[PDB]
Design a protein around this nucleic acid. Structure first.
Ligand SMILES: [Mg+2]
Ligand SMILES: [Mg+2]
Ligand SMILES: [Mg+2]
Ligand SMILES: [Mg+2]
Ligand SMILES: [Mg+2]
Ligand SMILES: [Mg+2]
Ligand SMILES: [Mg+2]
Ligand SMILES: [Mg+2]
Ligand SMILES: [Mg+2]
Ligand SMILES: [Mg+2]
Ligand SMILES: [Mg+2]
Ligand SMILES: [Mg+2]
Ligand SMILES: [Mg+2]
Ligand SMILES: [Mg+2]
Ligand SMILES: [Mg+2]
Ligand SMILES: [Mg+2]
Ligand SMILES: [Mg+2]
Ligand SMILES: [Mg+2]
Ligand SMILES: [Mg+2]
Ligand SMILES: [Mg+2]
Ligand SMILES: [Mg+2]
Ligand SMILES: [Mg+2]
Ligand SMILES: [Mg+2]
Ligand SMILES: [Mg+2]
Ligand SMILES: [Mg+2]
Ligand SMILES: [Mg+2]
Ligand SMILES: [Mg+2]
Ligand SMILES: [Mg+2]
Ligand SMILES: [Mg+2]
Ligand SMILES: [Mg+2]
Ligand SMILES: [Mg+2]
Ligand SMILES: [Mg+2]
Ligand SMILES: [Mg+2]
Ligand SMILES: [Mg+2]
Ligand SMILES: [Mg+2]
Ligand SMILES: [Mg+2]
Ligand SMILES: [Mg+2]
Ligand SMILES: [Mg+2]
Ligand SMILES: [Mg+2]
Ligand SMILES: [Mg+2]
Ligand SMILES: [Mg+2]
Ligand SMILES: [Mg+2]
Ligand SMILES: [Mg+2]
Ligand SMILES: [Mg+2]
Ligand SMILES: [Mg+2]
Ligand SMILES: [Mg+2]
Ligand SMILES: [Mg+2]
Ligand SMILES: [Mg+2]
Ligand SMILES: [Mg+2]
Lengths: 99, 208, 71, 138, 83, 124
RNA sequence: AGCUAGUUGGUGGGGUAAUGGCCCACCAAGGCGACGACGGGUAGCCGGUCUGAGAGGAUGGCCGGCCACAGGGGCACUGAGACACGGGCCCCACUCCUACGGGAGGCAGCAGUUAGGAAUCUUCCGCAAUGGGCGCAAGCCUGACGGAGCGACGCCGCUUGGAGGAAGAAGCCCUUCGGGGUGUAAACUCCUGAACCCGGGACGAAACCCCCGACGAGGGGACUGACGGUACCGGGGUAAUAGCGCCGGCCAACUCCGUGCCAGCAGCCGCGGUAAUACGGAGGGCGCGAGCGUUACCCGGAUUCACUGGGCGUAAAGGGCGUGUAGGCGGCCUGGGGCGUCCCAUGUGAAAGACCACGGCUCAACCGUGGGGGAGCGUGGGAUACGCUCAGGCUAGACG
């Protein structure tokens, strides 16, 4: 099957593209305690149909760019910006820890 | 290869008869009946309480001495036994017994285990009608050990058979004295053997 | 093998280094840091500069002597 | 924060047994009740009633004890000699049916939360289902 | 051209083969597609060759090509035999 | 350390600090001597414990210890180090294995021979 | 600790077998980052191998898979497939010849040389096998492979005899002077015959090929062995290599003399400074044995990085305290979804290995056949306690 992922649209800032953010709650091989790691996926958005904070289902496609390999297959729930919010705050935080 | 040397010394050391002579060791000469102390310059000297390790080691030596095997071979056998299902201790001993030379000694074709080995290695021994000259050679159950036809007429073997004529083999074995055959019928056990060893100790030793 | 080789020459105690080591100037010449003998140490035999002491010296390195006898 | 319920309950039980309190008391829960049932049937307790302590649903847990024993250390031989949460929050523990713990080589038990319910290790093996391994008791 | 052929195994002076279907461009001992038979030339065993016939037939059908020795072996254990 | 802590940081895998830098993790290095000198041992041993500064095929310049009584070891002696810090002499981490190149068998040792490179004596 | 400007996304095009910033033109200004980007160091990666009870830790030699690279760096061309180890162009570095303009090279193919190194093989035979390429076939190649050589480099098997034989020869050693020890060990008698010699002699090789049969099935024929005159078999037939470590404790095994904190030993502790069971020898003993040791490395022991399985008053260890962001974590009841979780089914988990069983080498190592197991991941269905999530309610926590 084509790999199906579930994630929240953390960004729309490129034409016909969404930065989707997929959580993946996997148990940690050595210790066991189930980690909640997350990855950004850049996803082809044919229309700019999908706005920020949309939780979408994403499918691997032929390439349509260096680090953009996914059709947005379908929407699940929309508008849950809370989920975009945490991510955004994390991103912001970095600005601190430097020199 | 062999131990290849002074034997009743070994008997003296392990503090117990080990019968690596077969005839003399039976007689009033095993240097246990006449004398019985660990050899060399510190013989009659006080025997201080040995370590736990020490005892185990001595037991292993005893066992090894009895079956006349290069330590490596012994170790391999032990390992095999351990790998094998069934009680390692007993199974190990069974495996040891299974040795062709040892079987021959036990069947009686030769009086001494060394002698048996020698007999095997010259080609006087024949499993299942074939020259099986390998002292190592573990025999499976249901296998007929026989003196080779060309070795039946030879005097030593005849003498041994005569000695063994009437007097019993092992419970695990069968011997036909006339045709010089002898079937390794079942596989042996622990109670089936008179051994001065406590194979548990051997196991422990190997475990370390 | 244990080689009999050493030179049993005497010397003036020049200077006390640590441990019980001394730069002692011999009968013949060169000053070598010479450490005190074990025997001497055992019998507590002190040395100070301004002494004349027996100093056994090696063939391998005639630079490290050994102060043998109690002065 | 009271930050585990199940573990706390287990710990409460343990503490009450350590000083031979006839009956402990632990705030009620479905899961806790289930656990107690499993314990009860296995026999680590006399059983539980469910009282209302000061307004709130609470389970008395009637702790079983071995007989008053002769000699120095007159201390009634505990039946729950030791009790241990295994899947705690943080490190949660899920074991396949093959991986299900044989606690004390059979003697005491391991409580397993399964899709089939809370049930002893034995039960889990019988039904052939693993689950989240709650705790062991012996 | 996926061949049916004899992958050498065993040891020194202990030659053994597997009647094995592989792409021609391989280490003769290399990762083959299917082990469809085995064969001992030294004929030590009573079962000195055993080829699975159906699988071999299938391989032949897709156009696997048996190497001369392999072909011979197949013939011996009736794969080309038409009744 | 809480399991979350472990996940974050893990365990610092204990790196085995190498006791001998003869290099390559090689069993022996043959170096050429510079100075066969003699050294005073540490606090509780007193001798004139022999030694040789050795300059190596591994570029390092280390003082190996000479075992056995005597030595045809000189100055420009091509010699094989063995590795194995000797307790007494401070900062001497090696040996000279005897019975190779310039170093020769400790003469007329009858007992522990293979360790001193002394060829079996021809018994009459 | 920030990195990035073909960098990120778009449109358009080029290029490609094909997607694509792969590349370009033009916009838009992103994209990644402490869930550790970039930088540095290091390194082929894996099936496996070792080790470990296991979890794990190391490691990736050999055999199998994949990559990369064929002096260093570009680059294409040809082709089904390469940017091409024994094809091409170019630059560079090196060696090689040059009539000085110029060309010739490429062993990380086998073998060998030399260097470096502690250290690593024969300028071997063969196409008989199996595989490759070509060709109708014959056949030709084939340093793939098959074998032989050398190396105790490992593993396994075997030999250096066996039976008897003193109340104990000699020699050597201790002694308390009687004796003890070495030791049935030897000597010696009988036996058996590794070696060695003679006779025989493989299996591995039946196809390809030819004829009959249709050049099909199928049947018959004929040829062919590097190893190798080897293995092995039959006869013949002599008693026919033992060594190395250790002997204070850990650790199996002690006495004497030499020696005097010296010469030495040492893995740690530590022996030696005139009775050394620790040094050197001697006897004796213990361990292993065609080996035995040392070195180096790995794991183990080390629950000494502790997930299993440690700790933090005083031993190393609680931040000087707040307040907080990220994260981690989370009370009680009901309902759904079922992501985690569990189960079942099947797909995958190559081969070899490792596990088991049998089989073949006179045994074994080694190998073959057959079985099973398998962490993981895929898909279909299911389960709902837990965790998750969404919805609703509750008051024990929290705040008011
Ligand atoms: Mg051997
Ligand atoms: Mg020594
Ligand atoms: Mg395009
Ligand atoms: Mg790019
Ligand atoms: Mg541009
Ligand atoms: Mg680098
Ligand atoms: Mg590298
Ligand atoms: Mg690695
Ligand atoms: Mg490989
Ligand atoms: Mg080169
Ligand atoms: Mg080039
Ligand atoms: Mg290049
Ligand atoms: Mg090419
Ligand atoms: Mg090229
Ligand atoms: Mg390439
Ligand atoms: Mg080349
Ligand atoms: Mg080469
Ligand atoms: Mg050379
Ligand atoms: Mg060199
Ligand atoms: Mg070779
Ligand atoms: Mg040729
Ligand atoms: Mg061919
Ligand atoms: Mg022609
Ligand atoms: Mg040619
Ligand atoms: Mg070869
Ligand atoms: Mg060999
Ligand atoms: Mg060697
Ligand atoms: Mg004898
Ligand atoms: Mg004879
Ligand atoms: Mg011949
Ligand atoms: Mg002799
Ligand atoms: Mg001892
Ligand atoms: Mg010692
Ligand atoms: Mg001594
Ligand atoms: Mg070795
Ligand atoms: Mg550990
Ligand atoms: Mg812990
Ligand atoms: Mg601690
Ligand atoms: Mg402190
Ligand atoms: Mg504080
Ligand atoms: Mg706070
Ligand atoms: Mg928070
Ligand atoms: Mg909850
Ligand atoms: Mg939460
Ligand atoms: Mg497999
Ligand atoms: Mg297999
Ligand atoms: Mg067999
Ligand atoms: Mg709620
Ligand atoms: Mg208040």
């Amino acid at each position: 099957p084509k790999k199906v992922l579930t994630g929240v649209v953390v960004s729309d800032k490129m034409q016909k593209t969404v930065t989707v953010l997929v959580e993946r709650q996997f148990p940690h091989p050595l210790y066991g305690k189930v980690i909640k790691r997350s990855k950004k996926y850049l996803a082809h958005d044919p229309e700019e149909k999908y706005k920020l904070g949309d939780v979408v289902e994403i499918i691997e496609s032929r390439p349509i760019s260096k680090r953009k390999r996914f059709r947005v297959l379908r929407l699940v729930e929309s508008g849950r910006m809370d989920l975009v919010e945490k991510y955004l705050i994390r991103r912001q935080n970095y600005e601190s820890l430097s020199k | 290869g062999r131990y290849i040397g002074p034997v009743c010394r070994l008997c003296r050391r392990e503090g117990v008869k080990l019968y690596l002579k077969g005839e003399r060791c039976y007689s009033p000469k095993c240097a246990m009946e006449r004398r019985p102390y660990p050899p060399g310059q510190h013989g009659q000297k006080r025997a201080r309480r040995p370590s736990d390790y020490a005892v185990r080691l001595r037991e292993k030596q005893k066992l090894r001495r009895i079956y006349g095997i290069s330590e490596r071979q012994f170790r391999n056998l032990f390992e095999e036994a351990s790998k094998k299902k069934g009680v390692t201790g007993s199974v190990f001993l069974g495996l040891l017994e299974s040795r062709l030379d040892n079987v021959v000694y036990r069947l009686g074709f030769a009086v001494s285990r060394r002698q048996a080995r020698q007999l095997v290695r010259h080609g006087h021994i024949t499993v299942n009608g074939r020259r099986v000259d390998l002292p190592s050679y573990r025999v499976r159950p249901g296998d007929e050990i026989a003196v080779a036809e060309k070795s039946r007429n030879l005097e030593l073997i005849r003498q041994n058979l005569e000695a063994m004529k009437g007097r019993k083999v092992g419970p695990w074995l069968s011997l036909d004295v006339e045709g010089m055959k002898g079937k390794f019928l079942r596989l042996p056990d622990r109670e089936d053997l008179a051994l001065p060893v406590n194979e548990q100790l051997v196991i422990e030793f190997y475990s370390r | 093998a244990k080689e009999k080789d050493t030179i049993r020459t005497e010397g003036v105690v020049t200077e006390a280094l640590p441990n019980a080591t001394f730069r002692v100037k011999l009968d013949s010449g060169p000053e070598i840091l010479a450490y005190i003998s074990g025997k001497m140490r055992m019998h507590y035999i002190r040395i100070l500069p301004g002494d004349r002491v027996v100093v056994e010296i090696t063939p391998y390195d005639p630079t490290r002597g050994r102060i043998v006898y109690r002065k | 924060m009271l930050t585990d319920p199940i573990a706390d309950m287990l710990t409460r039980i343990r503490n009450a047994t350590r000083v031979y309190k006839e009956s402990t008391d632990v705030p009620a829960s479905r899961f806790k009740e289930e656990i107690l049932r499993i314990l009860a049937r296995e026999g680590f307790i006399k059983g539980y009633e469910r009282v209302d302590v000061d307004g709130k649903p609470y389970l008395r847990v009637y702790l079983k004890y071995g007989p008053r024993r002769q000699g120095p250390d007159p201390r009634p031989e505990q039946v729950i000699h030791h009790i241990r949460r295994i899947s705690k929050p943080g490190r949660r523990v899920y074991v396949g049916v093959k991986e299900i713990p044989r606690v004390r080589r059979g003697l005491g038990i391991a409580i397993l939360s399964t899709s089939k319910g809370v049930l002893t290790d034995r039960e889990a093996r019988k039904l052939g289902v693993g689950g989240e391994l709650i705790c062991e008791v012996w | 051209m996926v061949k049916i052929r004899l992958a050498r195994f065993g040891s020194k002076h202990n030659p053994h083969y597997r009647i094995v279907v592989t792409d021609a461009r391989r280490k003769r001992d290399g990762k083959y597609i299917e082990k469809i038979g085995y064969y001992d030339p030294r004929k030590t065993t009573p079962d000195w060759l055993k080829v699975d016939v159906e699988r071999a037939r299938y391989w032949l059908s897709v156009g696997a090509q048996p190497t001369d020795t392999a072909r011979r072996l197949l013939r011996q254990a009736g794969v080309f035999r038409q009744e | 350390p809480t399991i979350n802590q472990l996940v974050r940081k893990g365990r610092e895998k204990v790196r085995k600090k190498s006791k001998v830098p003869a290099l390559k993790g090689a069993p022996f290095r043959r170096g050429v001597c510079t100075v066969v000198r003699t050294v005073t041992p540490k606090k509780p041993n007193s001798a004139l414990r022999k030694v040789a500064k050795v300059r190596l095929t591994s570029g390092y310049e280390v003082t190996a210890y000479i075992p056995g009584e005597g030595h045809n070891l000189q100055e420009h002696s091509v010699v094989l180090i063995r590795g194995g810090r000797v307790k007494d002499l401070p900062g001497v981490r090696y040996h000279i294995v005897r019975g190779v190149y310039d170093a020769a068998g400790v003469k007329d040792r009858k007992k522990s021979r293979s360790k001193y490179g002394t060829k079996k004596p021809k018994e009459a």
